[PDB]
Amino acid sequence: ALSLTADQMVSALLDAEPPILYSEYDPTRPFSEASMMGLLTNLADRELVHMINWAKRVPGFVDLTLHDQVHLLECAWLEILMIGLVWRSMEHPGKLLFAPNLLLDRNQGKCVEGMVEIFDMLLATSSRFRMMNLQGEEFVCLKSIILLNSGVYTDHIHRVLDKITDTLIHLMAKAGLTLQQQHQRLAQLLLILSHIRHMSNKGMEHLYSMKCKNVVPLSDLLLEMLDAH
Amino acid sequence: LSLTADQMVSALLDAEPPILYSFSEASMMGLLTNLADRELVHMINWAKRVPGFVDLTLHDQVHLLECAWLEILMIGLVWRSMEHPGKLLFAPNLLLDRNQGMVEIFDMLLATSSRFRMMNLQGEEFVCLKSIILLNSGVYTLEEKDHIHRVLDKITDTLIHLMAKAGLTLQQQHQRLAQLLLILSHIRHMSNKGMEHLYSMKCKNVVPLSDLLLEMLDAH
Amino acid sequence: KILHRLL
Amino acid sequence: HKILHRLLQD
Ligand SMILES: Oc1cccc(CNc2nc(Cl)nc3scc(-c4ccccc4)c23)c1
Ligand SMILES: Oc1cccc(CNc2nc(Cl)nc3scc(-c4ccccc4)c23)c1
């Protein structure tokens, strides 16, 4: 973990990437607020299972106690789903690729009360990534940083986070960025994580309101994840 | 954009707001919200002295302060509570432990204070971090965005300059820079929680909230 | 808004 | 235990 080189760090993270899943989108019927939220909560639920497998393959994560592993995932899961969504929407300006069969524009997000506000932030993050030309190697480092950092303040984790910082710098130097450009781009990337936190908190409040108005039934897992917030 | 790193640091240090002075459940949040209202007035003057901020349009200045104000209050609170392990110094005459607390937020602030203490955060680094929060927190919600990002890069350069001047190796500079910026995600989280708490206070209409604070909620 | 006049 | 606790084991 702390003995991995940067290249080994990147290879392990790339090989751990979860698959892209399909939604239960039924094209025979129009969208309603309930059926659209139903699709997103069903997808998130199936993605969480693959998330767990992925987190076990993030170096340093298996070293933690089960309780600490639970806490980190409880804190970060929606940030992780969202940075994944933004990443795979990068090559679809103006749209969010929730799934290959669920590629939506903001007009479709207006179907769910309170959704377009979060939709617009995700679109803006995707545009930010596109203009910075975020690389897949950088993306997987950022996603692992979220897993380890978001719940951390609530030494080993910090040593692993430092290794990931080293790996980001190594990637940037390998790509030919000057020394000044390296620390500038590191800062620009890490500052986007503050916005991803923000969007996660809005989506968690949105999911809570969907539950509390009986718009869609949440799985037992989703209910416990919500409940930890 | 023409200031040296040392000039950036002295400008931000010069602009630092003063520390202001301030139980029941209603009375204590009366104190906190009364304190926060007085600090906001000073924050506005400080923001105007963050290099580059006055170059922005009035609309953009309003948006950035509307998004960031509680984050900025909160990092200030953490900073002055840093030498008081296990307590929050809301004011010199208002030093609280967690039992007096809200407590979910209280604990998050305390853990941030302990992280600053753990890394021995310096005053010069603190003022850079507070300017980053101001410029970053609403920049995602063309020429004006490039100017904010150019100023943001300048403050990064200034942070790195401070760490180099302190003797850190290149590897240590990059690691500490990342450590500091990741704490800003936790500050965003606590501000989000604190806004929700503030919103519940305005709904319960027991604690008096100033016209100014009521407009800051409205923006969120 | 108040923030407008304050700035 | 939490669903998540069990899933982390399987
Ligand atoms: O990888 C995925 C799979 C599904 C959804 C998402 C992003 N999730 C959202 N995105 C947008 Cl635009 N609007 C909304 S409003 C509520 C949520 C939400 C949905 C589910 C759980 C928690 C919160 C949400 C990413
Ligand atoms: O510089 C200051 C001056 C006063 C308070 C704070 C930090 N503010 C809080 N801290 C804690 Cl532990 N709990 C709570 S619950 C609600 C708030 C809150 C207070 C005011 C406005 C918006 C939200 C809050 C920093």
PDB file of C-alpha atoms and ligand atoms in Angstrom, chain A residues 37 40-41 43-44 47 77-78 81-82 85 88 96 98 112 114-115 118-119 122 203-204 206-207 222, ligand 1:
ATOM      1  CA  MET A  37     -36.570   8.728  -9.189  1.00  0.00           C
ATOM      2  CA  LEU A  40     -32.054   6.591 -10.256  1.00  0.00           C
ATOM      3  CA  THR A  41     -32.491   4.905  -6.860  1.00  0.00           C
ATOM      4  CA  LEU A  43     -29.357   2.237 -10.391  1.00  0.00           C
ATOM      5  CA  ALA A  44     -27.587   3.732  -7.364  1.00  0.00           C
ATOM      6  CA  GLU A  47     -23.945   0.485  -8.253  1.00  0.00           C
ATOM      7  CA  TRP A  77     -20.945   6.855  -1.330  1.00  0.00           C
ATOM      8  CA  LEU A  78     -22.972   9.588  -3.067  1.00  0.00           C
ATOM      9  CA  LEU A  81     -21.549   7.912  -7.499  1.00  0.00           C
ATOM     10  CA  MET A  82     -21.577  11.548  -8.577  1.00  0.00           C
ATOM     11  CA  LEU A  85     -21.507  10.124 -13.274  1.00  0.00           C
ATOM     12  CA  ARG A  88     -18.785   9.252 -17.797  1.00  0.00           C
ATOM     13  CA  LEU A  96     -25.793  13.278 -17.865  1.00  0.00           C
ATOM     14  CA  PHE A  98     -26.685   8.016 -15.759  1.00  0.00           C
ATOM     15  CA  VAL A 112     -38.506  15.525 -10.520  1.00  0.00           C
ATOM     16  CA  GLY A 114     -35.751  19.798  -6.908  1.00  0.00           C
ATOM     17  CA  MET A 115     -33.705  17.690  -9.348  1.00  0.00           C
ATOM     18  CA  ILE A 118     -28.514  19.225  -8.778  1.00  0.00           C
ATOM     19  CA  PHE A 119     -28.538  18.331 -12.491  1.00  0.00           C
ATOM     20  CA  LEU A 122     -23.307  18.003 -12.195  1.00  0.00           C
ATOM     21  CA  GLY A 203     -28.562  15.003  -3.338  1.00  0.00           C
ATOM     22  CA  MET A 204     -28.739  13.468   0.124  1.00  0.00           C
ATOM     23  CA  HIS A 206     -33.144  15.473  -2.047  1.00  0.00           C
ATOM     24  CA  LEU A 207     -33.201  11.695  -1.462  1.00  0.00           C
ATOM     25  CA  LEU A 222     -30.208   2.890   0.495  1.00  0.00           C
TER      26      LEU A 222
HETATM   27  O1  LIG E   1     -24.308   6.881 -10.525  1.00  0.00           O
HETATM   28  C1  LIG E   1     -25.498   7.504 -10.197  1.00  0.00           C
HETATM   29  C2  LIG E   1     -26.628   6.813 -10.225  1.00  0.00           C
HETATM   30  C3  LIG E   1     -27.941   7.483  -9.876  1.00  0.00           C
HETATM   31  C4  LIG E   1     -27.960   8.763  -9.550  1.00  0.00           C
HETATM   32  C5  LIG E   1     -26.649   9.551  -9.526  1.00  0.00           C
HETATM   33  C6  LIG E   1     -26.651  11.037  -9.146  1.00  0.00           C
HETATM   34  N1  LIG E   1     -27.789  11.228  -8.280  1.00  0.00           N
HETATM   35  C7  LIG E   1     -28.672  12.316  -8.615  1.00  0.00           C
HETATM   36  N2  LIG E   1     -28.423  13.026  -9.723  1.00  0.00           N
HETATM   37  C8  LIG E   1     -29.260  14.038  -9.990  1.00  0.00           C
HETATM   38 CL1  LIG E   1     -29.030  14.998 -11.453  1.00  0.00          CL
HETATM   39  N3  LIG E   1     -30.299  14.431  -9.281  1.00  0.00           N
HETATM   40  C9  LIG E   1     -30.533  13.735  -8.222  1.00  0.00           C
HETATM   41  S1  LIG E   1     -31.904  14.151  -7.159  1.00  0.00           S
HETATM   42  C10 LIG E   1     -31.429  12.796  -6.135  1.00  0.00           C
HETATM   43  C11 LIG E   1     -30.303  12.159  -6.588  1.00  0.00           C
HETATM   44  C12 LIG E   1     -29.849  10.928  -5.836  1.00  0.00           C
HETATM   45  C13 LIG E   1     -30.132   9.804  -6.493  1.00  0.00           C
HETATM   46  C14 LIG E   1     -29.823   8.425  -5.928  1.00  0.00           C
HETATM   47  C15 LIG E   1     -29.274   8.369  -4.719  1.00  0.00           C
HETATM   48  C16 LIG E   1     -28.987   9.663  -3.963  1.00  0.00           C
HETATM   49  C17 LIG E   1     -29.272  10.863  -4.448  1.00  0.00           C
HETATM   50  C18 LIG E   1     -29.745  12.635  -7.820  1.00  0.00           C
HETATM   51  C19 LIG E   1     -25.506   8.971  -9.832  1.00  0.00           C
END
